[PDB]
Amino acid sequence: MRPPLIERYRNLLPVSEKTPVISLLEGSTPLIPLKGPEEARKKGIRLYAKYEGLNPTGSFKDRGMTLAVSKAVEGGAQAVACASTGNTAASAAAYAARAGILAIVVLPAGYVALGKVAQSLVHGARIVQVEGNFDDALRLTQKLTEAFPVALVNSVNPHRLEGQKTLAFEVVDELGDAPHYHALPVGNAGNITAHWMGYKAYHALGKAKRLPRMLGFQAAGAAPLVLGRPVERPETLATAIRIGNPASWQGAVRAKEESGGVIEAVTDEEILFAYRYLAREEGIFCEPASAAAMAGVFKLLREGRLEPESTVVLTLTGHGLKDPATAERVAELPPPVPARLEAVAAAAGLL
């Protein structure tokens, strides 16, 4: 029996008997141990993939949305709103539907994967596509929630992060201690901040004896945290993190500093390589943005900056089905052949 995330960690969340539990049964995702890569195995470095693509709406956002929406409804909210590169919008839409309230999502025109758009569509969210990027959308949405009785459910809402910190809890619960390293993508920066919050809380509770080094990775075309200043024209095929001015900037920096980790850039080429590696070699399909976490691991490995005899946990943020269009970038679909055995056997390379 898979429990609502809010119930699994009720004692560690800002809820009470008065809180309406709006759950689609999120969290408690699998922690898949990885075979390699060989580059890691030879150094006594093993990897685990926290597969967040198996959350109800396909991404880790559900962890924060369940709490955010539940608390909003508790406060009487009739509607919720959020700007998004796709996943937060899909999550807000699904939970709003579950709760029976209105969901308004603002998206950057042309920079949202088809899977995500399809989700906001089908779940019935009121969609607004703006002729601008995510950063513009976020600025606009916050102003919208200041002029109308609509609950803002973007990461700036504390409940989003309190809910997402549970990912750290689950890793420790399963492994018995926090890992030496925890890698994940960084877009608006709420997740890296939530992970660290989770690890610190569990360490204070004594459930984790050690504190992991947080390894955050941004796409080279949208790496404000890496360059040290906002990026006016963020660019990258991993549109989930096509973000130039992260709202949790300070949270990310502190997480990096406090944990002794890093926040670095990986190229779109490196993202595609890791993306293909996970799917073709480990049998795990995550969207490009998520693959950035693995790309980061590959990077530090090749540079000898990951200590031997360590456990590395990767947070694969979203399922690959979120963005099917990118598959054609790492593989080719063979043209159709006649429905005759001969043609099939040849096409299958069995002749």
Ligand X SMILES: Cc1ncc(COP(=O)(O)O)c(CN/C(=C/CCP(=O)(O)O)C(=O)O)c1O
Nearer to ligand X, 213 or 319 (CB): 319
Q: Which 300-319 positions form the footprint of a copy of itself (CB under 8 A)?
A: 319
Binding flag, residue 168, ligand X (CB under 6 A) = no
Binding at 234: pick from ligand X, a copy of itself, none (beta carbon under 5-8 Å per type) = none
Residue 189's binding partner among a copy of itself, ligand X, none (Cβ under 5 to 8 angstroms by kind) is ligand X
Give Cβ neighbours of residue 259 (< 8 Å, ≥ 6 apart): 196, 199, 211, 212, 213, 214
User: Does residue 259 touch ligand X according to CB under 6 A?
Assistant: no
Look at residue 227 and give the partner it binds from ligand X, a copy of itself, none, a contact being a CB closer than 5 to 8 Å depending on partner kind.
none
Positions 1 through 20 that interact with a copy of itself (CB under 8 A): 1-2
Amino acid at the residue 229: R
189 binds ligand X (CB under 6 A): yes
Taking CB under 6 A as the rule, does residue 186 contact ligand X? yes
Q: Does residue 78 contact residue 126 with C-beta atoms inside 8 Å?
A: no
- Burial tier of 261 (Cβ tally within 10 Å: 0-12, 13-18, 19+): buried
Number of Cβ within a 10 Å radius of residue 331 = 9
Place of tokens 């590395």: 312
Q: Which is nearer to ligand X, 205 or 325 (CB)?
A: 325
Total binding residues toward ligand X, as defined by CB under 6 A = 27
Annotated binding site, which residues? 87, 187-191, 317
**Judged by CB, which is closer to ligand X: 143, or 209?**
143
268-274 long-range contacts, Cβ below 8 Å, gap at least 24? 268/219, 268/220, 268/221, 268/236, 268/237, 268/238, 270/295, 270/298, 270/299, 271/219, 271/236, 271/237, 271/238, 271/295, 272/237, 272/326, 272/329, 272/330, 273/298, 274/298
- The site partner of 57 among ligand X, a copy of itself, none (C-beta below 5 to 8 Å per kind) is a copy of itself
**Interface contacts to ligand X, rule CB under 6 A:** 59, 61, 82, 84-89, 154-155, 185-192, 240-241, 247, 287, 289-290, 317-318
